[PDB]
Amino acid sequence: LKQTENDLKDIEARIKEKAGVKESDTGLA
Amino acid sequence: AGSKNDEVLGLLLPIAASTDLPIETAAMASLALAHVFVGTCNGDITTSIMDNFLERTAIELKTDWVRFLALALGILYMGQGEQVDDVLETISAIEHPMTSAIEVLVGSCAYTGTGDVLLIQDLLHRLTLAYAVLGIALIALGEDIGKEMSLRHFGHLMHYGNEHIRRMVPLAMGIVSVSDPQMKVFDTLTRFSHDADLEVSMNSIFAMGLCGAGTNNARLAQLLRQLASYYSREQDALFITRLAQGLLHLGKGTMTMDVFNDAHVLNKVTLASILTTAVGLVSPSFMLKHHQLFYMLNAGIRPKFILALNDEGEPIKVNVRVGQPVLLNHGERAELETDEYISYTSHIEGVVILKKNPDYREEE
């Protein structure tokens, strides 16, 4: 129950975040 | 147990055949029959139970029934070598993860003793299911090597996120931790008590109570402080903590758990008791049934004893060393006192009939 919930959350969040930071890093941060 | 009879088995046996659990009820009867006929030889039960499973009688399609017939056979026929093969076919017939663990256990029980590498090794690959983690406990007592690792090893497992691992390790601890302190588990459990959910808190506090059973003051302290710091803040909290205070102080605080004793011998009964309470005692946990099952935990629970007797061999004044409080009269609580004095038969721990040298001949 819990183990599956944590991993899905972490993959799901991470992909959105990874897209947002890379966007803010454009410029050269 | 100790006065097993066929007559009740004959009466109970066709009602078990009727089998659905909410009515005739006798699907669970299997647990009771197993524990009665532990550790001996009786083919009638083995066969009757074996046919009924293999056939697939009545409403056999309930999971709980497949569990009951599997376990019943294994429990009853402890130490019966060849005979045991019959039981192995039924258990083997419906595969599970509980079952890969149980192959080594039936072999322990049947072939007599444990001492070999294989059986610790075969479980160790699965661990790194509930029944599998439980199983190191039962195995390790024959392994010269095995016992020291057990305490580290399940310490790790409690912390494991997944919910199942979290329910099953505390019960194991509730038995263990009345003679084996482990710092890591007790410190963790405090945070997990308010982790994210009502059910986990139920189980945590209950768990602290089992572990605390019969052991009070001293080295217990880090676990003891957590218990005092809860009493109520809700009506669910009041209820659970109160039940914990009875567990903590069960048998006036001076009761113990041993699955192996000082008189160099194991008990088949004690393996079966733990096994049977595990199928039950699930009311405030996963695998929900009903409240009454808690009581099966009792069979395991032993008063502490070193019993001195003098040269009468039946109650008589005799003294052996101080406790924590003075030198003792017979039947007076304390455990593990070796003495100077010479036995009739064998100086060790346990009930001892004692004799004193004529140079300081005494009743003591």
Binding site: - | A1, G2, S3, K4, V38, G39, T40, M78, G79, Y111, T112, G113, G115, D116, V117, D144, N261, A263, H264, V265, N267, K268, V269, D311, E312, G313, E314, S343, Y344, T345, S346, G350, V351, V352, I353
Partner: protein, 165 residues
């Protein structure tokens, strides 16, 4: 190399209480002539009386002859108790045969001391009859009966209990 493996590699039990054992009994599993030199190695061990190291090595040779071949003289009692623990205790294979053939020579002149060790743990009737035989004092009897009754299943029940009790 020959005797260790031959003992493992049979589907039957092992363990006897025989005046015959030779590690070759019934069907052959050792050569007669090989056996007799091995028999010569034992009265060295018997003369040494350092039996704790001795039983372990003996166990490694995995040969049943040596334990009873050792006992035919000398102070039984202490030594026989040390041997009785060593055999189950040390190797990760359960071993029990060495003690039981050794017991057969032991039963002739008896001994209460060794009998207690085998009698707990194994639970075997002959051993329990021998602790009893020696005991003629109901007080000593009562201490034996305490340690025996922690071996629960066997001692629990009618067809044994009350008939003993």
């Amino acid at each position: 190399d020959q005797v260790e493996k031959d003992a493992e590699d049979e589907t039957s039990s092992d363990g006897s209480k025989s005046d015959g054992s030779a590690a070759t009994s019934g069907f052959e599993f050792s050569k007669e002539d090989t056996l007799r030199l091995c028999l010569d190695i034992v009265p060295y061990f018997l003369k040494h009386n350092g039996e704790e190291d001795a039983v372990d090595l003996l166990l490694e040779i995995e040969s049943i002859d040596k334990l009873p071949q050792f006992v035919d003289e000398n102070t039984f009692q202490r030594v026989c108790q040390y041997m009785v623990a060593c055999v189950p205790l040390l190797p990760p294979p359960e071993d029990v045969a060495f003690l039981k053939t050794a017991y057969s020579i032991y039963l002739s002149q008896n001994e209460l001391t060794d009998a207690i060790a085998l009698a707990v743990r194994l639970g075997e009737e002959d051993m329990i009859r021998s602790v009893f035989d020696a005991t003629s004092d109901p007080v000593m009897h009562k201490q034996l009966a305490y340690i025996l009754a922690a071996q629960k299943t066997s001692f629990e029940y009618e067809g044994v209990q009350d008939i003993i009790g």
